Design a binder for this molecule. Structure first.
Ligand SMILES: CC(C)(COP(=O)(O)OP(=O)(O)OC[C@H]1O[C@@H](n2cnc3c(N)ncnc32)[C@H](O)[C@@H]1OP(=O)(O)O)[C@@H](O)C(=O)NCCC(=O)NCCS
Ligand SMILES: CC(C)(COP(=O)(O)OP(=O)(O)OC[C@H]1O[C@@H](n2cnc3c(N)ncnc32)[C@H](O)[C@@H]1OP(=O)(O)O)[C@@H](O)C(=O)NCCC(=O)NCCS
Lengths: 123, 124, 128, 126
């Protein structure tokens, strides 16, 4: 039983990365898709996780993902332009909590995630 | 600020895939890694999500990921061989719930996830 | 709110006190005061109490949308301890209303405006 | 174990610790009327609290002090009056700063009732 490799961030644009606020855009391509021809769940999550890490960095911190929860609201499609917005909603000494949401070019919600990040040091 | 693309399943072996139980192994490679040289969180999640889909298919169903929660317990390292075990723990009328575990070659727990899948149909 | 007497039944299991400040179209605001029965052995609002607050308000969001539904999954982050006599504001909002699923965000903040806890509920819609 | 028993009797009308050894805990309880919602099903908060407290017990059995940082729960099948629930907690990761517990609740017919994961922040030894 064969299935294709899943790649994330073969293209992206960082529109914003400042003080706990991150906006990144990307276009869904063939390497983003699952066997059903929709944006893979792992692809969408990876978008959110990377943007969460980007938020961490924008706070001048180094950290690792400790825990995450994600809801998939609307399918992502080939050639969709996805906007990934990440923001810190709580900054603690050892943990941070980030909200990350993805919307498509028509402004429709694709997925929504919450990340608990473990602070591992200071940039 | 530049960062590399993250790839998943550039290599894998399906050891088991039958009746709601799936076992897949894979090797952590350079495309698996984040900027710190550890297995990317999205990579690990993708391993879990894909094996969850594999569980759905092994039950003779087609489905979509509705919700997922994941805990990252121990870092995945370059050249680690990861074993991904997924099993259905509840089959509802339109939804299924999968437990997925990733352990390394040393038998240490790497991460643990729960997936709520939406059943979209019945396979042929 | 005789129209939601079921809530008022379950609420007297989860609140020794509460006030609904807002309840309209997927947006709910409820306040409550932390009491002794809310506390664990160490004097903090125990996780089950806070979770139950969020769950109850999530049910309220569902009702405010005119729906019947069942919780499939829930996630909660604990940010700051709740203390005796704290006044907690529990805000619920629908972030996705589908015909088959709903997703609710519930946030709890204290009288000082600090984040107490943050939760998400994944619900299966069962009716009107 | 004064803290666990205060919290357990303050939240539950009955419980039994059947097993408690080194990150593995088993507790049973019988669903009573106070456990039920207006429609006669076990409250989501009741089930969650069962899981959270058993998670705290797992922490204790490891000889640690900690606080719940994050939790996820999946509701699989409704709990009913007179059901006997078996709540099993297992540590799947004991870290220096965090612990992760897997908690499963099954009923007397062996059916999965709910499944939860708890992320605990370790605050000390105990
Ligand atoms: C799971 C899901 C179908 C639930 O549907 P919902 O809560 O009712 O939301 P909506 O009412 O807005 O419906 C959205 C789409 O799903 C369809 N749909 C809704 N309920 C459905 C159901 N019970 N059965 C089959 N299709 C359904 C709708 O017809 C609609 O189709 P459209 O794209 O042509 O408009 C929806 O949330 C979803 O598609 N999430 C994205 C899943 C995903 O991308 N996972 C990652 C890849 S596996
Ligand atoms: C999140 C995490 C660091 C929590 O730490 P923990 O519960 O104490 O677990 P451990 O005791 O086994 O420690 C693991 C590492 O984290 C370090 N660490 C633990 N607590 C720390 C703390 N308060 N501050 C800084 N570092 C800490 C440890 O020193 C150790 O580092 P090392 O392997 O280089 O020696 C750990 O669970 C983990 O590494 N999870 C996987 C993270 C991941 O892979 N995310 C996806 C990629 S971003």
């Amino acid at each position: 039983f064969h299935f294709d490799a899943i790649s994330a961030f073969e293209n992206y644009e960082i529109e914003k990365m400042r003080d706990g606020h991150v906006v990144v855009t990307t276009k869904v391509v063939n390497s983003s898709l699952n066997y059903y021809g929709n944006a893979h769940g792992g692809y969408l999550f990876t978008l959110c996780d990377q943007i969460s890490g980007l938020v961490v960095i924008s706070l001048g911190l180094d950290g690792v993902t400790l825990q995450s929860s994600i809801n998939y609201l609307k399918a992502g499609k080939l050639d969709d332009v996805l906007t990934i917005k990440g923001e810190c909603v709580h900054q603690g000494r050892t943990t941070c909590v980030m909200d990350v949401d993805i919307t498509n070019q028509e402004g429709r919600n694709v997925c929504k995630a919450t990340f608990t990040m473990f602070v591992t040091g200071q940039r």
